[PDB]
Symmetry: C3
Subunit: 213 residues, 3 copies
């Protein structure tokens, strides 16, 4: 087949060392050669991002430019409709064919709340999902009937991600970084340092555009 390509969505307001280091650390224990970052647009019934749709692309571009691992996909920024996760993967499966392995990166706490999403049953039909294990927290699913769904498709063999097109779930041990897009905004609104949390190109973009102030 072809090489496994992982997808990684998020709001990215702003992208930060958490997003990048956690995934590139994943790529070294899973053999990820490609990682496509899909920045979403937040549905209107949720707080909308501070940095607009353009700036978030600029901040991502600058942050990814010297990392060949990552490659940026702006479907959801140019999409009129609001972003639905299982819908982007239907497109990816549609465009990339049925035999290329696809993987979607989500966090542990988004696996906990996972049968919530629109069309949860269709995600594992069109891609694997890799789960960023939140250390220290238990493995507990919300409703003990799709706790069975989890160990049915759970696997500890990373070959399954490369040798099959979809259907499995891998749990990956990632480092901890005490940084989020909420942590960042607060230290800037108060004016404490941020060069340890943010790529220098992006922190400079933030200060130029006057973001989070």
């Amino acid at each position: 087949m072809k090489s496994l390509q992982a997808l990684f969505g998020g709001t990215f307001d702003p992208v930060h060392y958490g997003h990048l280091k956690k995934v590139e650390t994943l790529a070294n224990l899973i053999g990820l050669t490609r990682v496509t970052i899909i920045p979403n647009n937040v549905p209107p019934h949720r707080p909308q991002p501070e940095a607009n749709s353009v700036q978030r692309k600029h901040m991502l571009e600058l942050a990814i430019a010297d990392k060949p691992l990552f490659t940026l996909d702006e479907r959801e920024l140019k999409r009129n409709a609001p972003s639905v996760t299982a819908q982007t993967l239907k497109e990816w499966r549609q465009e990339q064919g049925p035999d290329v392995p696809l993987a979607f990166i989500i966090g542990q706490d988004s696996l906990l709340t996972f049968p919530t999403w629109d069309e949860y049953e269709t995600i594992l039909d069109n891609a694997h999902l890799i789960v960023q294990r939140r250390p220290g927290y238990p493995l507990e699913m919300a409703q003990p009937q799709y706790q069975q769904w989890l160990e049915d498709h759970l696997t500890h063999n990373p070959e399954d991600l490369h040798l099959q097109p979809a259907g499995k779930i891998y749990l990956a041990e990632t480092p901890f970084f005490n940084i989020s897009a909420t942590i960042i905004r607060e230290r800037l609104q108060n004016g404490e340092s941020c060069e340890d949390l943010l790529p220098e190109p992006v922190l400079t973009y933030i200060n130029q555009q006057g973001l989070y102030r």
Copy 2:
């Protein structure tokens, strides 16, 4: 809150790749952005170090100059008294404020003998302690009554070190290095190579000052 600041003490005679690489591997999996190296002065009842207070400070300064992670604290070298751990941590909690998170880095073999250390109860009051896990050994505490003390304050979530001022104990996965300050002093008195165990600035300083010969 403010950045978690973690303190790391020792004699450092000389500092070597054991100290640095073990802690900078810690920093990547715990989110440590700053680590303050506190070299101690050995109480008179123990063999005193070969290299004097100045050379040990120079050797550290040379080793740490290009690593922003580590900052050096010479309280104990300029102190008249003999170095007591729970006394330095009491200074740090006082000077730094009661709301900043503090951690103290120690090895596993030093936590087994921990209620041996003076004021073992004052440490968890003012700081967290991060324990360097000696691989291949069990977690057995000396007197199975404060084995309950270990499991009372143990935590497997590195958040607690960041989001709480003090009180927890985190066990960290470290690499093994077959290098120690005793090993080095012998390999120098015997005259076999050391550029794999020691930063080249520090090994050059030692060869210039003629230490361990």
Copy 3:
């Protein structure tokens, strides 16, 4: 004692990021300062390598040339006989002294298929997601007899232990590569650029 010196053997046709990335990850977890790459010549009873003895040396030499962790040993390439693993270990023990720790790196399923522990430890590259199961229930007892969880045992003793090391997963093998070259798709994520360039010069795996 002296430094622990690990030996790492293989065909290396071609050498690739898997061989190297996997071991340099090991070295950091075990404290390996030196790793001697011992490419083998295959005994005639299994399929022969594509690149001859020279090209497989050059490719290795280009991979290892700016990695101080690895040094290269061409015993088995210059050897008249075919290579016998415990014969290389016996020579090393002889030249090196009885006091210097030695370890031999092998993959898990190559351990699935044996007298190493006179002269050296064996560090086994754990295929992730597969169990520790030995075939014949007498050297499943040999495994846990000499199993060790303390990397000290590899650095403080000259042999006798077996260390099972967690390694990363890389979707690359020499077999994967040969086809992706004969099929004509990229390999720069699987193969060092000096080595991949060497392969296109010599027209290897095409």
